[model samples]
Target: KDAQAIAKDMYPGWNLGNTLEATGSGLDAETSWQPTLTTQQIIDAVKAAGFKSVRIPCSWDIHSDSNGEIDAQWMARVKQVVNYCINDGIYVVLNDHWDNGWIEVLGFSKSSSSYQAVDEATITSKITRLKDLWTQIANEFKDYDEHLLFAGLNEPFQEYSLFSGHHEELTPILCRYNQAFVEAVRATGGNNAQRTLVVQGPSTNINSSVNYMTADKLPETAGRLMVEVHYYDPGQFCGTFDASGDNAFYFWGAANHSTDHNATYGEEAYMLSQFGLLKTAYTSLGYPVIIGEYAALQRTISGDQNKHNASVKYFYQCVNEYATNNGIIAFAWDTNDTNGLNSEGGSSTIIDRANSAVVGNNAMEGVKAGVAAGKWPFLEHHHHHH
Candidate 1:
């Protein structure tokens, strides 16, 4: 319900992903890890885990060649998977992911700051391809409801400067591309127009882009739109690191958890900064927030509460608590071979646990409990009051 009357109906959802592999640089095929996940497996697992949503991040670009077109085999494979999940009453998200890091290749030259640039034609061509892919997918899944979300780009920019440093010239360019994306899909004239279209914030939905609300204006069509933010907080803990020891943090904003500064703080503070600050921020914003990706890293060993297990427990808890209180939505990054799930890394392992039906963490069990108990608010009640 908006400030007016009920604008439209947006249903609640749960999510999961399948991890299948593909070929590598040579004769030996390394795990593709770039959009070839098993759909049926994900459906069975999410259904078993009691989740209502599934997001399939894929790389159609890899298979699509220089002509920018996809064949039936590829489309059918993905559809078969998404179909199974959605058919079982689970909301699903499908979008371009990191195959050859195409999004980055299309948008960047060197570092986001390289001042390096691509010609208008190149950008246009790529955007056209992206639109075509979405159009096909949208048309294919027109029967799905608003619970199904269509995203613009998956982790779009490789460097922060893409938006930060080039704010002057690039701002409109960024909007223009997204604007074109909106226009392109809508042109398909199906559920594409009315479907909930998700836009990624700068730095691939980094906290800094929370100000992305500026582009509040959307297409005239009645479709729903929402902001998406990727959470890989406690980066050091989540396990995606470079030569640097840890990514710089906005811990102070999180520590404050004050409404006064909440408006000014970046999303970095909201993601993994702390739960208190995150809930407050999302609550203040009327727009629904979607946590597009998140998961724990498993390093082997420890059964009951190992590093992987604790982090996995927290990963699920974080999204559940945050989404629950903020009226937000979430999807696990992927329960792939690399992630802790399947006992591969620190992710969703119920798929491989000794007993799949048993809920492993106290936190997860509590989430179910609270949901049953008239909807659980967060645990900060003892510490703070609105």
Candidate 2:
């Protein structure tokens, strides 16, 4: 069931998350309801657009009280969705979504004075507890086949911890955390011993995280492991939703930061071609990489369906195109809108008008053709898959 093993799963299904909207944070992990969106329903539509894989961004916090004990009711509800994706014969990725910064606990938070003291015992305890988190999570889903994948974290950030050290020198604590997750899940024996382990890079999954990626090898880890690095050059694609802001945005060229007066804009540089913008060293190792998130903003910071779809599909197009060329797997952040990956509801123009986007028109056809012919160098060509 591994997407790689099943070439079709690589096309990717879309997503929605969180059971409660009131608790929604800026992160798309939390949503207004449970798995209210059915599986076959989403697949039928996504398949309408010609995609194969489905990644579900889940938040275990919904099932847990303050104590971190997963709720049986929520877990059961989640299982139904997992079963949903598997029955469809597509790949599904489940992860612990950000929870009031609790996922940060997996980072150096355990030793910081903000978290605690950097004591030896404290460090070990943090690692142990981190492993406990994945162990519990794995034990919960161990019964699933390879078709179901586990992502250690989503948009993992030491963002708040950035000021703590020099920009270039800071070590990503997520590495240590992800390493623990691999070992924890591997300990469960059975198929869990060989399941694909997906890990997200650090510094909010920025290019720097890619430069410093240090993957761990579980007993039988082999090629079943994958590393994810999200690519949204911030100023360009992920610019302020307000197209009328003091900072002007463009549809083409390198995205820029207003603070960076010297930064290039509308210069034809792409997410990957942007060179130094992202750490491409990982590509040299032949390990599978997924661009988990990267989208253009719609109308304003406030969710707008039309603008959101245009931007998201555009971003997805560039990334999916690049991944196909480079021979890497790419997973767009999510499908629906209400999850906050973009709009408040999937009604955004991309969802409502998916057929019209450049992605739908160009890259969709490109990826499908490449997947079928086993010949992808999409970066060299501008075209759609479906």
Candidate 3:
């Protein structure tokens, strides 16, 4: 089946973050950030919670030796997790997530903002590693059917600032990386010839991605491709603490907006507009759109559970209703984050990896309600073609 057909079954996808993709330490230290190892029981719990898909963000950086060779043990472990999801009829999206600073180092930077373009030689070297990594990944899972979708790179231009002149110049190279991803995957035969593939946009920024990702940017042979972008829009609201140190919107929605931390944009209206562009660009054109990441950070710092709960639930409800209605698949970005990312200290997690079960009452309720709102042509009870 094509991506659109398969994605219809993948509403309310959940992201397995800070686990395999945790790079501050290494793959060997799986419990460094995410304490719970991905198990069949964990995946089964996710499926039982009504999520039809799971996006496993993995890092191959530390696991790789020379010539882009991944450790066999690492590959086998990842495969084991993927099998756990598929065996339970949960669709999986495996991707090369933010590994070490290898790809980030190739970009241009000035202080906190990194939007400048690097020389072609620098890009080529990084892409060489990228191609090699993807080749191994594609070949390893080539036999799996459409239930397994391979997202090229998780937010490829993530290190750069968006909508700036520097970002504009870097668009072509980012597109090139995506092109390389598609070509490498297609070269692997078996079910991969027609398996679904996802390509992320520049920075996975909504504005920059929609503008630069024209029809011609991808391979013509890739008829089953899906365009991907992420949303942590209104960083203050969605991701309580911004790395930039500029945003700190502690509350969300107009009712809950804090005077001290009110953000400029990324509200429901702004998010809806962003979704509209994806709808026009891909879904309206017969292709599918995957929102690879999004979340409203739980307000744990203030100890204001009531407002925090309201803000998160409202955001989830809006995104769920808007994206699904527009034919875009939505996945909540989560980290079973006890320490939280960079110690920002907030969560979007539905599963408590420690307990190996779904936790966070408000978060889970919001997600379940959102997923319930999503309408798909395929029945939720139906399994994929074997």
Candidate 4:
């Protein structure tokens, strides 16, 4: 099967966030950010929850030695997790996440305080490092079939503060990194030669992607390519409160809107328009699109906490519905932060990993309902070998 077919089969995915992607050394790093170590039971719980795929945001550069060799134990642990997903017939997407910001920070210009240059030499060095890391990963999973996929980077973009600005200069550099990833993986032979690969757009922002990520700018991979993006459209509504101690839009969507807490922008029309751009640019052109991460924080407010909760659930439902309707596979971002509405940043917890149970929250139920209501535009067929 090609990329689009595999993607169709991976509808309604889930993210194993803040775990393997946490910055640290050795296997202990898996638990550094989250409490429970990843278990087959947890993945089983995910499957039981109706999620057909899992995206493992993993870190490699930071876990590797000074010589750039990945720690043997770390590699084994990652492989074990991949197996956990695969053994259950669940599709898995493994990617090099923001490991110490080595690849992510490459988008900055030399003048930026990050001190990284966008010159050919700097890009070439980064590409070489990327290929080296992926070569090791590809070889390890050479025998794995199309059920396993690889994503080049998490969210390759310039500094977050400067993200809104147009940075056309960085697209080519990002493409180079993606090209290197595809080449390195295909070079490993076996199933990887035809493995489906996912590449991130500039910052994984929808508008930036439509503007900069043209077909010519993408790597030369033929049919086995998919584009990745994330959704946190109205950051104020999806994230925590701002520095000034205000600006956290607890209410979202039109129906649940409160005169005071309702979000002013990125509403239903805005979301559909953004997703339509991706469909027109990529998905409609045979390259499938995946919303690798999308979720809204479950927050608490002094007035009408019920509306706040309802708004968050509606946000999740809308994202899942719109994304799936637009030929995009939506993966809800879950950090296992079951703190509910008490914690400062709020919680995106969908499943309770410790007990293998779904958190009894509106957000969780919303995702389930959205997926149940949504339908893929294309029919997926299983290929059987005689």
Candidate 4, 1-386: lDDT as tens digits: 67867877797889998899999987998998989999999999999988899999999999888889999899999999999999999999999998877888753454445444467777788888999999999999899999999998988873565444545767777878888999999899889988899999888888788888877677864388889989887877776335112676778888887757568898889998999998888877778899999878886567678887888788878887877877898888998888755743577788899999987368867777777777666523454342
Of the candidates numbered 1 and 3, which has the greater TM-score value? 3
Which candidate gets the maximum TM-score versus the true structure?
A: 4
Candidates ranked by lDDT = 4, 3, 2, 1
lDDT of 4 at 64: 86
Candidate that would win on lDDT? 4
1-386 in candidate 3: lDDT tens per residue? 78767877788788887788877444455667767777888888888777889999888867887656898888888999899999988899999887765664353332234444477777777677777888899898978888999987776556534335555777787777877778788887788879888888777777787787766675543358888888888776776347223466655667766535555667778878988998877677666778888887665554455675677787887787787877888888878874442233566777776677766566668777766775643322346663
Q: Which candidate model has the greater lDDT, 3 or 4?
A: 4
Worst 10-residue lDDT window for candidate 1 reads: 1-10
Error of 2 at 202 (Å): 1.7
**Between 2 and 4, whose lDDT is larger?**
4
Please, what is the whole-model Cα lDDT of each candidate in the order they appear? Answer: 0.49, 0.51, 0.74, 0.82
Q: 1-386, model 1: which lDDT tens digit per residue?
A: 12101111222333333331131332122234333234455466656655666666665666665676765676666677677876776666666665565554455443333546766876777677767877766777677665566767766564554434654344344565566667777777766666666666555544445444343433322225555566665553443442112232211123322221121322333544443333344433444456676543433432323433444444455555555555455555544333333342333333432233333443244234423332323322234333
lDDT of 2 by residue, 169-217 (tens): 3344556567777788888977788788777766544455655654432
Q: Which residue runs does candidate 1 get wrong by more than 4 Å?
A: 1-31, 34-42, 110-115, 159-171, 212-223, 242-286, 298-312, 338-350, 353-386
- Model 3: pairs clashing at backbone N, Cα or C within 3 Å: none
The alpha-carbon lDDT assigned to residue 373 of candidate 1 equals: 31
Clashing pairs in 4: none
Residue 180 error, candidate 2, Å: 0.9
